[PDB]
Task: inverse folding
């Protein structure tokens, strides 16, 4: 009733997000003790609806590791996407051009899959914990937390992996002198709505117009997920279903294509930045996923990045826990950040190409249209774009 | 007034640069009399030594028109180039990737050939003229000039072609209300030197380093042409052959590749900006070449753009003087500017990828290395680059 | 690395222009360590022949700061100007309309005063330095420079202020992503001559004619300062003194007014554009004067703007160094940019009203004359013009 | 060939529009016979809905000439206006600044007044006539026309005056060699709507915003007239009343100011350009009103200019027909065109200050706000604006 209980694990994992839970499960199947603490309820996580686009590799990781094959049953495979600009829609054919596809499967469903998998396998994931602090980072680290029932624990592990997300608490514990932050902020955001309607397109539509950028994308057959470019500080309450659909028509509708429209069942404005914390390992803290980086949503590279991170980190942990090798853990930061910059650059290129530069810089708008034309008009261009989108298989 | 002699031509051409002379010669070979006025001496023009990289199409135009095949004899065909960064040199194999090559031939040599060809055919080309004005652009145009020996003349033409280059006089005579000017100015320039030594590589090497960008390019076997990135207002006299070679060393040298060095025989600071005047026809003035647009030198598209300009303009002029159709003349601006923005986009991409972002932009520089990696690492990437470099063949 | 002598000050000043030197003297008189570095010799600066038109307030700053009262002795106070169009000259009476005057006094004399004053008091002004570099701007800044005798120094300051002029080195060192450049380029320039002759009128004459614009201005009693509108790349080499005086005659003379004339003792062609770099503070580098903006000469607002910048910046610096308050520095860009755009708008209006629209816009010329009549015909109009001319007294 | 009945007048007036009828009545009360031919039915003319902004002078001409004093009772006098930009509304106080007002009184009401006045006083206004031809203009002119009932007439008079409006037939009969035309077209138009609602402001609100320009105007107390800036080719059909009012809120609403609204009862888009036909007298045909010029709606200066034209035309006719002097008739064109150019410039300046320049010229937008600030903050500026707005009292 006053005991701060000591409990032991091999890996302390902070975050019941996709990256944390995926790492938890791979550690489980390689036989390494992991305890995962999260500050939100399972329900909070499941009611937070982020759409998702999974690269070939992320879908393979979910599957070949046994986490959950429901992605293959309930998530739709797409062989391409379309760029809409100047009234024309062009098709980037992933399969014809690079022979890979992507799978559209909501990220919350990945969460549900992974959390259920861990529970069914009796994994140790504590939700709704509080008073979270981290200690002895370069030693044998220790995590202080008060679990959901009010009980206090000191968890002691060999390493901590902080998968706290972009509001990371673990990464706030690193001394500034031993880290470096890379930032780049944008003057626009996405206004994202979930609306009840049939497919207005089969594939994703990225569209660029004088009035802004807009993405026509799908989540359910009943509900579709749509985004359009907006001011960073817009209040959804000052928005009518009519006004939302008007913005969408002005950017997408016309020239022999009409956008199906429905009731606006949720709306939310979603800001974003490029962020990179390097190196991704400090002492025995490893950072993974959005705790360590973030990207503009355009590329769909975020959750792919996180899953990738946990995979490379896990390979390091297994090498170490099987043979005592430190070579892979030391190479974790290099391997991860390498991909992180590739993704940063690609998501940046996509953002630049598709969003109309806020405020009408005319040479800028001209150059942007020039680029869009060259990309859709060159087979090498479409192939390079598809390679980046579908996960750089090579 | 005293008499300024009144003379007629069908096309009065302002500028004895390569675009002006090439149009003059093409109008000649189709039997259309064109008179060329220039404000510099033939000698002034020839002492300006700018290197040149000619796309296949430019070489075909120079040859199949009879202008000069000396491009084939004295100019070297290159089949690729190299992007150097982080000590490694990667090679874009143009012929392997897109099946085109390019020809390295000094731009002043092209001027020499074309000027000689005009003289040899008796073409009217008057150098060192002054008092140059342009009048009645929407009427039957008129060019006033005071030729070399002091005679004042009024030339009357059916059309004026302004090929004045970036110090163009003609584009200033087009009313501001009826045109649009497009800008983008860079925070660096090029320091260009000619030094006597053999080629330190076979092909051109574009290198990007912490200290800046540098281009290793060839002019003679005796003389090599080098450039390195510099501040827009750098003064060449505050630099020694030693200091210049230092900048080149710190940017290019390393990892088993050494830069040969020689006596520094010329040094000059060479500014540049991206500019586009649209539309490229006003009344009966047609603008071409640096009169209507300019590029960063990185992409090598400037003289190529000029030749493309004059080629499309000649086809319009021929259509009209043979069959009276204005369709080709009316579509000149569209055709020309379509290609011009293509080049604008590509030259911007090359520039931003290789020049080091001034000021310790950390995200900027990190993403730059990411992009350079994605491009040299992907065959589609190198293919897209090669396609554009060589002139968008297919 | 041979130790570069390291020296510290509180404010590093880049530029020995009037704005820079005046900043130095204001910092000195409030007792703040200010060190000024320059790349030109004092004699080179002095051979720079620029006339000047001082707003009332600028003359007040020159005196009430102790910089130099020589302005009042050797520079003459003017109570108005005359607008010449349609062969008629109308007079704007500054004192009658807004009750302020302006003081015509060569800008080089202001440089002389400020150079002499800093030198005669403790002089921290280093001429003819080279190897100018800027570092760690968002931190505690550093300036590297190689002074005139070859000494290398690393200077460390709390703030850097860029008064480099339009050939600024500082504005090229601020990351492109954190700045914006504003442009507007004109289709004309000024051909400026200094000629020995008596004053042809009382005040400056702004004259507008079918043949172009011309400004008759005063510098000495012996020498008058004259400008006429010309093509941006006009070369004086192709110009005789007779032809110059013909241009002035066709632009100004008539209806019983003839311009007195003399030997053309200097001639030079003078380019200009409207340019604005915002924000005017990045980190602890502050930009001022032609380093941060430029305007067309028609309105006479350039050096006035520079001095205004330095005054507001000095006030921020003093507030901070006296109470540790940052507020005045933080709003520096705001105040400066407000006044700067006001000057920008005024100078654009003056230029657009007075120069003859290149290319025979008939509607443009008619609208121009309509405006000029409506302006000189309305008392409110002349008062608005005078208010802006004299510096917005109120 | 059938004989056309021969009829006599002194002044042939073509157009029973405001200017034609006003000339008719001035001629009547001065005892000069006026005969008026019109191509529309009386109901046709009266159904034309132009809002109206009458200068001081138009109100004086309407009242003191006896046309109809109904304007003072039934037209509302406005003593200022409000410039809304950057969410701020500044007020131009016409009465405070120049001591004149303007009267908002629909132009349709002025037509009714003038038509009723001519009919009751004995007047020749022949509506719904056709088969218009005009002959022997530089002599004693002759006009052929067919009234609505089929009667054929040749009317023969001393002078013809054309008030046909901007689709004028008379100005198309003038030899191009004997005239000059001035044109200039703008890239936008006005979206004008008539909607039932109470006053959202007392005075007119001109508002300038990112999303466009918008004018809040009155016709009734019951019905309001509104405009917003849009593409010259936009169809009211593809518009919902909800969508329209959205455009208006995005342009005007904010900072605690909301636009009252009701359902939209008429909508129509209004193209506009600047035009001037000179000289306005060719032979013994005189031109007035929109037959001879056109303006941007921004100033409301069209009907005012027309009335001024007819006033000077009548005064010329009076000098000649009473004392036989041609001095007033010969100089009519000069005076009319002088004021016309004044109004052209004023309408131009208002538009450039208020319309957001389509396509994002960034320096342009900055200069625009600079102008707006300098004008609203200066008493001379607001006074000059008010002077021109209210009619150039003097
Ligand atoms: C196609 C596609 C589209 C995308 N669109 C968007 C978009 O529109 N907007 C956007 O912002 N991102 C977007 N992303 C990125 C995606 O939303 C992120 O990956 C997401 O935040 C999940 O994070 P993670 O598991 O990948 O990284 P992790 O670092 O594992 O983050 C998991 C999430 O769990 C939460 N969490 C974990 N541990 C804790 C803890 N201890 N305390 C509190 N919270 C915790 C975090 O808030 C975090 O967001 C997109 C990605 C893809 C592939
Ligand atoms: C460092 C550098 C590297 C480059 N590398 C390449 C490369 O690899 N490939 C490539 O294709 N290009 C290259 N360029 C060329 C560059 O892109 C230029 O834009 C290109 O040369 C086009 O200019 P021009 O000589 O055709 O001028 P033009 O448009 O062809 O005409 C210029 C001529 O006009 C004359 N003229 C000026 N004013 C008047 C007047 N009033 N009346 C009459 N005549 C007048 C001038 O005297 C001059 O001779 C390079 C340039 C530089 C500086
Ligand atoms: C009525 C009127 C008329 C005007 N007419 C003109 C006109 O005709 N032409 C014109 O150009 N301006 C004109 N001006 C504007 C005036 O020249 C500028 O506003 C003024 O130069 C701004 O002050 P500054 O100190 O930035 O100028 P500057 O004189 O440019 O001072 C900057 C100094 O910094 C030095 N410097 C440059 N680079 C470096 C470096 N890297 N390190 C160290 N020092 C460096 C330069 O040598 C220079 O001496 C006019 C202004 C007014 C009010």
Result:
């Amino acid at each position: 009733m006053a005991n701060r209980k000591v409990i032991t694990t091999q890996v302390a994992i902070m975050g019941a997000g996709p990256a944390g839970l995926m790492l938890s499960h791979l550690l489980a199947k390689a036989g390494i003790e992991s305890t995962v603490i999260e500050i939100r309820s399972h329900q909070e996580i499941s009611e937070t609806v982020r759409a998702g686009i999974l690269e070939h590799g992320s879908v393979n990781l979910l599957v070949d590791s046994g986490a959950s094959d429901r992605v293959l049953r309930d998530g739709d495979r797409h062989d391409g996407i379309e760029l809409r600009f100047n009234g024309e829609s062009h098709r980037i054919d992933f399969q014809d051009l690079v022979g890979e596809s992507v799978w559209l499967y909501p990220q919350t469903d990945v969460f549900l899959d992974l959390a259920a998998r861990r529970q069914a396998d009796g994994g140790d994931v504590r939700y709704s914990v509080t008073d979270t602090t981290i200690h002895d980072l370069e030693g044998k680290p220790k995590v202080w937390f008060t679990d959901a029932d009010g009980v206090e624990y000191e968890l002691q592990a060999d390493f901590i992996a902080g998968a706290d997300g972009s509001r990371s608490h673990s990464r706030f514990q690193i001394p500034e002198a031993q880290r470096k932050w890379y930032f780049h902020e944008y003057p626009f955001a996405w206004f994202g709505i979930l609306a009840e309607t049939p497919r207005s397109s089969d594939e994703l539509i990225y569209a660029n117009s004088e009035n802004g950028f807009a993405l026509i994308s799908q989540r359910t057959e009943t509900v579709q997920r749509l985004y359009f470019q907006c001011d960073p500080n817009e209040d959804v309450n000052d928005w009518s279903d009519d006004r939302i659909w008007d913005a969408f028509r002005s950017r997408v509708n016309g020239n022999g294509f009409e956008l199906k429209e429905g009731p606006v069942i949720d709306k939310t404005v979603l800001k974003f930045r490029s962020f990179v914390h390097a190196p991704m390992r400090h002492g025995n803290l490893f950072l993974a996923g959005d705790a360590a980086h973030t990207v503009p949503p355009t590329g769909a590279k975020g959750l792919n990045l996180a899953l990738h991170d946990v995979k490379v980190l896990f390979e390091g942990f297994d090498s170490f826990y099987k043979s005592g090798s430190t070579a892979l853990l030391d190479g974790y930061s290099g391997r991860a950040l390498d991909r992180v910059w590739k993704a940063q650059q690609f998501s940046y290129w996509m953002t630049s190409m598709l969003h109309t530069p806020v405020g009408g810089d005319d040479f800028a708008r001209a150059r942007q249209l020039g680029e869009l034309n060259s990309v859709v008009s060159s087979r090498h261009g479409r192939a390079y774009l598809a390679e980046a989108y579908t996960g750089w298989p090579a």
Summary: The domain at 4-52+106-183+273-350 of chain A is CATH 3.50.50.60 (FAD/NAD(P)-binding domain). Residues B 14-20, 37-40, 45, 50-53, 107, 132, 163-165, 167, 169, 190, 192, 270, 289-291, 294-295, 297, 300, 302-304, 306 surround flavin-adenine dinucleotide (ligand 2) (CB under 6 Å). Chain A touches chain B at residues 98, 180, 182-184, 274, 276, 341-342, 344-346, 348-349, 362-364, 366-367, 369-371, 373-374, 378, 380-381, 383-384, 387-388, 394 (CB under 8 Å). Chain A has twelve helices and 23 strands.
